[model samples]
Target: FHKIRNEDLIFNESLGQGTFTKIFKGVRREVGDYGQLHETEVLLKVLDKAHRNYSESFFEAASMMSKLSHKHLVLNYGVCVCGDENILVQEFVKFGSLDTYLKKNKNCINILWKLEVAKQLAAAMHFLEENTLIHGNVCAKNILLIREEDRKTGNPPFIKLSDPGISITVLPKDILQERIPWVPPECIENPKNLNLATDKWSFGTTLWEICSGGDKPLSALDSQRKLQFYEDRHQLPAPKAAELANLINNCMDYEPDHRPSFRAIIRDLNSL
Candidate 1:
C-alpha cells in the first residue's frame, strides 16, 4: 500500500485519545487523489508504537474497508506511515462523536434529528450486512455527525460510521460502559465471537441512546451493582417514538435470532 508523506499532512488539533491510539483533527494540505485529497480536514488516527504488532493488521483493515462505500460509513482518505507509527486517515466531522455531542448539548437536536440518525444508521448497517461483516463495536462514539465541506444545503448534518473492523476501542475506565451497555446478553453470558445477530442487539442500545440523548447503559444496578435480570432481559427500553421504540425492542429480543436483519431494519426505519 502507498504511504502518505509528511508534506501532505498537518495536525490541527487532538480530537481525543484512546488506549491504543490518538485521534487527531487534522488537515491534508496536499496529497494524491488516491482515496480523495479533498479530505483536508480529516480524522487522523495514530497507532501507539508499543502496539506495533497490530500495525500491519490495522493497515490491512483500512485497505479492506476502503472497498466498502456508503454515505453513512466513514470514508478513508488514505494512510501515512509516521515512522514506527501507522496513521489511518479518514473523514473529520465538526460535531465529534455522538455520545459527546449528545452529552454536551441540550434541547438542540430534536426528535427529527434522532429519527434521521436512526434512519441513516440503518442504511449503513444494512450495507455491512450485504458485505458479510460485523461492526463488532457500534456505539454513539463511533458515529460521526458530518456534512460534506462543499455541500451547501439547509438539511441537517448526517452520520458516518467510524472505527470499522476494530473491536472495543475506548477508554479503559469506560470499558464496561462501552461494552456492556450495547453488547447482547448471549455474548455477555457466553463470551464468544461477535456475529451479525449480536450487532443488531447493539443497534438497539445505540438507537435508544441517540433518542434519549444520554448514556442509558443496559445495567440496571444502582451503584456498581449487578442484577440477575441482566442475564435474562438482554436490553433496556429505547426511543419511545412508538414505532422506533418498537423497532429497537424487536432488535434487542432475548433470543438473538429474534433480532431483525439489517435489511428489514432499514424497511422499518423507512416506514417511520
Candidate 2:
C-alpha cells in the first residue's frame, strides 16, 4: 500500500484552524517505480482520534466521499489512519471557502458574478441529485469557489459543495433542534426529519444569501422569535427578483412536498 511520508508534506499556517480540526496546506509525493511526479496542492484535515466523535465523522466522510466525484466536489485524494490522528486529504481550493468571501465582501459581488455563482451552484446540485445524494448542509460556508484567475468568462465560478459533516444517507427518523433561523418553516418545525426536500429549502436560502448580498432570509428575526414566528405564521419575506423570489418562496413553503426537486431547481436556474 502507498503511504504519505513526512518529507512529502508542506504546511501553510495562514489558513489557521477549523471548527472540528486543524487544517494545513500539503502536496502529494510520487511513490514506487512508475509513480507520477507532479505536485498537487491538497488540504489536510486532522482530527484527534481519541475524541469520541472521531470514528463517526471519519468513517462517514470516507464512505460518502469515496463514492462521489464531480468537478464541483472536493476530491478526497487519500486518508491516513496513523496512530492517534485520523486525517482526510482533499484537493486544495485556492480561493478558499465561500464563508471567507462572504464575510470579507458582503453585498459587493457584481451582478455577473452573482448570476454565475447561482448557475454553478445549480449545476453542482444537479450532479448530486443525479447520484441520489443529498447535501444536507447547503450554506455558503460549505461551498468553495475556485480561484478567480482560473475562472472562465461566462462560465460561472467553479463551485464545489463541500463540508459534508452533517450529511446523511437517508432522512432522519425523528424531529430535533432547529439550527440556524434561516432554515425553511418546515424544517424549523421538525429539524431532524430532513430529506432532499429540506435540502432544497436550504438551497433557496443560499440563493437568497447570494442575491441579497449575504442578507439572511430571516435576518430580522431573533432566535426565539424566529421559531415562534415560523411555527405560527410560516412567513418569510419575499426576495426582490420576480423569478428568484418565487423560487425561494416555493422552496420555503411549509409543505415539504411543495418544494421543487433538485431537477426542477436546475431548470429554473437555467431559465434565469
Candidate achieving the largest lDDT:
1
The prediction achieving the highest TM-score against the true structure is 1
- Off by more than 4 A, model 1: 31-39, 148-154, 168-178, 189-191, 216-229, 238-243
Cα lDDT for residue 64, candidate 2: 74
Clash pairs for candidate 1: none
The alpha-carbon lDDT assigned to residue 85 of candidate 2 equals 59
The list of candidate 2 runs beyond 4 A from truth reads 1-8, 14-19, 32-34, 48-50, 106-108, 149-155, 167-178, 182-192, 215-222, 233-235, 238-243
Per-residue lDDT of candidate 2, residues 110-228 (tens digit): 65676678777877887877787766778776778775522445454567777555333322322112335445565555555667677777777787776665566565656776667
The 10-residue segment with the lowest total lDDT in model 2: 168-177
Estimate, for each residue in 103-175, the C-alpha lDDT of model 1 and write its tens digit.
7764676766777788888888888888987777677878887852222465765788886433443223344
Alpha carbon deviation, residue 239, candidate 2 (Å)? 5.1
